[PDB]
Amino acid sequence: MIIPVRCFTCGKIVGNKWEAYLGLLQAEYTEGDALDALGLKRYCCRRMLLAHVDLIEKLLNYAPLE
Amino acid sequence: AGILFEDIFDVKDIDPEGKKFDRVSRLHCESESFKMDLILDVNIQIYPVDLGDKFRLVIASTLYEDGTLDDGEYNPTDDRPSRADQFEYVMYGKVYRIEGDETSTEAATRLSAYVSYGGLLMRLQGDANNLHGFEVDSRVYLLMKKLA
Amino acid sequence: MNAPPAFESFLLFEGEKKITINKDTKVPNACLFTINKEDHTLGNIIKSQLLKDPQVLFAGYKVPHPLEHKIIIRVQTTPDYSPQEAFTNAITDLISELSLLEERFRVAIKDKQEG
Amino acid sequence: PYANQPTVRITELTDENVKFIIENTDLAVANSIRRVFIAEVPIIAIDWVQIDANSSVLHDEFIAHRLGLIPLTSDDIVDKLQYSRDCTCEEFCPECSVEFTLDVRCNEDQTRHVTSRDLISNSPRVIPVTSDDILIVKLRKGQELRLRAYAKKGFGKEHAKWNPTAGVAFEYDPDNALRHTVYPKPEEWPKSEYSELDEDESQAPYDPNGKPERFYYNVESCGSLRPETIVLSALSGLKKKLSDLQTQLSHEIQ
Ligand SMILES: [Zn+2]
Ligand SMILES: [Zn+2]
Predict the structure, then answer these.
(1) Any idea which positions bind Zn(2+) (chain A) (predicted)?
(2) D14, D32, D226, D231: best mutation site toward chain C, by most C Cβ within 10 Å?
């Protein structure tokens, strides 16, 4: 739905890296290089940014009921 | 004394049927004096023995060298002088079988005594005269010391 | 629904004793310490320190059930040294060890920061 | 019959992790210290989220759960703070909690990112550690999120939001000298970073007289506490637990 705050396994903060991850990918980085640049060494943390599907961007297409 | 048996053996084979337990080896040993055949499972990991070694073996009823019964219970705080201090490897088991070449007519000349040190099995074959101390379902201590 | 509250794994409720001693009648000089609202954190460390004592003939611990919060520590000792005395001495040894470790860790932090 | 004399050696100390080695200690003390790093170091984390208005796409419990997981700077305040359950108040006074206020209205057409920057504390010592900032929720034009929340002292045993560590690496016997693990093919296994063997061995020779010692640690902080503060608070808390147990035992014996 949205990027989780913590890494599920180890508890490292990941929610403050989704926009930076996408920005690095727009800079023509391999996904491994992007995750290494963000400093995610344990594959538990890397799994979360590598496999996250951001549906909130799609949910924001619908107008709010206010 | 309480020493049911004593001898010096030499290892003539280490693990004859191929290795089957990564920490235990089935030594086959001969005795030069009593000419007893010995099979004995030894935890080689803590007491490594290789082929052609020699060692004094002693099967004893007790360890306190006074005839005082052991009670068959683990007492780490023992002030009595233990016979085990004169030996490198000490195991504690129960003799569970005494076979022989006896017929219904005559007694046995050759006896084979089997002991189980917690699972580590030993057989001691030889003439009956040296195995009269062994009796089934009695506790024994195997005391083994390498000889130079 | 039936999920227990998260706080009732370290909190004693009303009229619950933190630690209870019961002599073991099967063996002389043996006691069972049932400590409530504890886990392997204290069980394993206290067991290890008790094993370091030379007068302790037996020291073991178990959690009876993981969903419940108790540790039963069985301590058997030589006839001239009570299990309660051994338990107290083990805890004082652990406290001294951790105080020394705090001091040395502080010294190491100061050295690494200065360095 | 008495305590070991443990010796510390700090190998690396950054602002996000501390690496150190403890020698002359039994395995149980080291394991309990790691356990106390994970589950018994108190920090300050958000609890009691009261939502006044939430027209975002994420439902209320989702937002509250995300707020709980935000780490808060609790380096020096948490020790003098009290557990709310023990305090004598309406459960929220400055001596047992820290108020937070979020009030975000998305008026521009562009997607508004509700980050941890938008969490306003009433105490300057306690802020989100990122203040990139942790995204809480994205808002559309006309959507609003407005709430107030507090932050209580708790530790990781109660809930994982209070866990201060982002993964505690722990190791001992890097060459497998004690053979506490038995490799079927030891050649296939990579050397640990603390290994001291050459590139022709796979394991150290077996040591029957060996005992575990020289435990290697690497405590990575999520951010709410400095790693050295995590270790010091951990040792203090374990000592406090043992002293309280001694007090209760002395009362029981008496
Ligand atoms: Zn992770
Ligand atoms: Zn209060």
Answers:
(1) 7, 10, 44-45
(2) D32
Task: Tell me how close the Cα of D167 comes to any Cα of chain C, in angstroms.
Answer: 18
Tell me, what CATH number does A52's domain have?
A: 1.10.10.60
CA atoms within a 13 Å half-sphere pointing along the CA-CB vector of B15:
14
Q: How far is CA B101 from CA B29, B107, B111, B116, B138, in A?
A: 21, 8, 7, 22, 22
Residue type, D194: Y
Tokens 């060692």 identify what position?
Answer: B55
Contact D9 C54 (CB under 8 A): no
B5-148: CATH topology:
OB fold (Dihydrolipoamide Acetyltransferase, E2P) (2.40.50)
- Around C20, how many Cα atoms within 13 Å sit in the side-chain half-sphere? 10
- Domains of chain D with CATH codes: 1-42+161-254 (3.30.1360.10), 43-160 (2.170.120.12)
Contact C105, D235 (CB under 8 A): yes
Residues 6+ apart with CB under 8 A from A18: A3, A49, A52, A54, D135
Q: Are strands B37-43 and B138-147 parallel, antiparallel or unpaired?
A: unpaired
Identify whether the C-beta of residue B83 lies closer than 8 Å to the C-beta of residue B28.
Answer: no
| Residue D105 to residue B108: CA distance in whole angstroms | 103
**Structure determined via:** cryo-EM
Under DSSP, the state recorded for C8 is: T
Residue from B75, B77, B79 whose CB has the most chain C CBs within 10 Å, to mutate? B77
